[PDB]
Amino acid sequence: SHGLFKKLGIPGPTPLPFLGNILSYHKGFCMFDMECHKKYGKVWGFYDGQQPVLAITDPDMIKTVLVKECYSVFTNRRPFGPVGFMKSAISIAEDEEWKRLRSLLSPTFTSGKLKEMVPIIAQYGDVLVRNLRREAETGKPVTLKDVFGAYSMDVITSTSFGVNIDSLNNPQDPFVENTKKLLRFDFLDPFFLSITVFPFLIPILEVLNICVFPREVTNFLRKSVKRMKESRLEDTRVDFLQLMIDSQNALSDLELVAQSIIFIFAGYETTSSVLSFIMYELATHPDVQQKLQEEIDAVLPNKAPPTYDTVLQMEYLDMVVNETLRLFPIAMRLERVCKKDVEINGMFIPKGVVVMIPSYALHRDPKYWTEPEKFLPERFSKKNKDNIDPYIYTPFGSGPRNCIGMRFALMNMKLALIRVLQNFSFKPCKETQIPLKLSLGGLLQPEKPVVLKVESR
């Protein structure tokens, strides 16, 4: 079992029994990957408990697994712990289950729908500005994540469901309260450490109704969507929620609820985390913040409201987003379960091996980015933009299994950026941690919440 990579002549760190190389994650897995690539070259192997994982860095080899051989050999991700009814969520579904969900849902995020989401989010822009404006009157430091989370919460419920929930006016509110508790994939937590290591356990927890998602959070989330469904049943916009009732003429009751959670989570978690990273970056590189404010002000003269089209006009904003995602790619790795023995670009890979693309590492590889640790948007300009491999920069993954809400995360993040910047400026203070330190566990977050001060323009 543990001799796989030795017998295939692939480098790697030497693994202990039972544990695999799991202990090397103590320094966080993004750093572990760094060390590895650096130590072992272009390809290397390790063991997550008894699980072989092959890291891969060749840009072609990557396009092969992500784009060409996806449907036939690398279709799935790693199965991960007790999930229960959430076993049908799109991000977790496999093979045949997945293809349908992927096409049943993909039509949620087309131009027409995206354009149609603008004016609803336009309402939640103001409430954000107006909210932050009060902190600019109180004049004491701000938890970006808090207030961006609220914004995030507001926009996902209202678009994917058509049901306003007024989160921003609620410093206290059950929706966010529960959605943040939904999954902390933390190794300090013996639980995740132990399932991840000893997976022979997972089927047992599945019979005992235990789940990685607290029974609590999921109870409140099932009931909410249970209800949001029957709200619509009362009235007489084809959206996420709609599209799925329309399928109820093959997507079942619980199936319908499970997509919502994924969406809700994605919508809430990702969006707010990234926006906090960017505002940190802007406020620690003031030149860029002014540059961005000028661009915005030039495209949206005298605080004029952002629209679908103006947003895509904003080239620097895009450079700013892209560079922050380079530095902080919130999925730190991409992964695909190899389901049949196969040979990709001069390499055999046996059935069952998890193939793994260390995004965080590839993003910081001093072999593809001059001064890779530094925040430099100009690397994303038209001028320098073509010199950038689409299989090295993978913040939304790639191929058929790539991020389904990319275009919606982006439009939405920018919408919020614009509206903030065209009213406020942001500055470091005494509790603002410099430079930033990622936390060690599953999620890519800062170990201390993002706090900045806000001046009113």
Ligand X SMILES: CC(C)c1nc(CN(C)C(=O)N[C@@H](C(=O)N[C@@H](CC[C@H](Cc2ccccc2)NC(=O)OCc2cccnc2)Cc2ccccc2)C(C)C)cs1
Which residues sit at the interface with ligand HEM, rule CB under 6 A? 90-91, 102, 262-263, 266-267, 270-271, 274, 330-331, 334, 395-398, 401-405, 408-409
Site string for ligand X, 339-378 (x = CB under 6 A): ----------------------------------------
The one segment of 113-121, 203-211, 278-286, 325-333 that binds ligand X by CB under 6 A: 325-333
**49 CB-near residues (< 8 Å, 6+ apart):** 18, 19, 20, 22, 196, 197, 198, 199
Q: Does 247 bind ligand X (CB under 6 A)?
A: no
CB of 161 to ligand X, least distance (A): 17
Site string for ligand X, 281-320 (x = CB under 6 A): ----------------------------------------
Q: Does 58 bind ligand X (CB under 6 A)?
A: no
Amino acid at 23: L
Nearer to ligand HEM, 414 or 419 (CB): 414
182 makes contact, choosing from ligand HEM, ligand X, none, with CB < 5 to 8 Å by partner type, with ligand X
Site string for ligand X, 125-144 (x = CB under 6 A): --------------------
Q: What's the CA gap between 28 and 198, in Å, rounded? A: 20
Q: Does residue 91 sit in helix, strand or coil?
A: coil
Token pair in block for residue 269: 């978690």
DSSP letter at 65? I
What are 142's strand-pairing partners? Answer: 452
Q: What angle do CA 451, 456, 457 make, to 5 degrees?
A: 125
* DSSP-assigned letters across all residues of 94-121: -HHHHHHHHHHHGGGSSHHHHHHHHHHH
Q: What's the CA gap between 246 and 335, in Å, rounded? A: 32
134 burial (CB, 10 Å; 0-12 / 13-18 / 19+) is exposed
232 burial (CB, 10 Å; 0-12 / 13-18 / 19+) is middle
**Residue 332 C-beta-side C-alpha neighbours within 13 Å:** 17
β-pair type (142-143, 51-56): unpaired
Is 403 annotated among the ligand-binding residues? yes
Among 105, 117, 147, 262, binds ligand X (CB under 6 A): 262
140 burial (CB, 10 Å; 0-12 / 13-18 / 19+) is exposed
263 makes contact, choosing from ligand HEM, ligand X, none, with CB < 5 to 8 Å by partner type, with ligand HEM
185 makes contact, choosing from ligand HEM, ligand X, none, with CB < 5 to 8 Å by partner type, with ligand X
Q: Does 77 bind ligand X (CB under 6 A)?
A: yes
CB of 356 to ligand X, least distance (A): 8
What are 452's strand-pairing partners? Answer: 142
Token pair in block for residue 440: 């060690």
Q: Does 184 bind ligand X (CB under 6 A)?
A: no
CB of 217 to ligand X, least distance (A): 9
Nearer to ligand X, 88 or 284 (CB): 88
Q: What's the CA gap between 222 and 331, in Å, rounded? A: 26
The one segment of 72-80, 169-177, 283-291, 445-453 that binds ligand X by CB under 6 A: 72-80
78 makes contact, choosing from ligand X, ligand HEM, none, with CB < 5 to 8 Å by partner type, with ligand X
The one segment of 136-144, 329-337, 358-366, 430-438 that binds ligand X by CB under 6 A: 329-337
Q: Does 403 bind ligand X (CB under 6 A)?
A: yes
Q: Does residue 363 sit in helix, strand or coil?
A: helix
Q: Does 266 bind ligand X (CB under 6 A)?
A: yes
Nearer to ligand X, 48 or 255 (CB): 48
Look at the block and give the residue holding tokens 């900045």.
452
CB of 140 to ligand X, least distance (A): 32
Q: Does 100 bind ligand X (CB under 6 A)?
A: no
What are 16's strand-pairing partners? Answer: 20
Cis omega (within 30 of 0) on the bond before 435?
yes
Do the Cβ atoms of 371 and 72 come closer than 8 Å?
no
Among 335, 372, 388, 407, binds ligand X (CB under 6 A): 335
**366 CB-near residues (< 8 Å, 6+ apart):** 372
CB of 418 to ligand HEM, least distance (A): 16
What is the binding site for ligand X (CB under 6 A)? Answer: 48, 77-78, 80, 89, 91-92, 182-183, 185, 196, 213, 261-262, 265-266, 270, 330-331, 333, 335, 403, 442
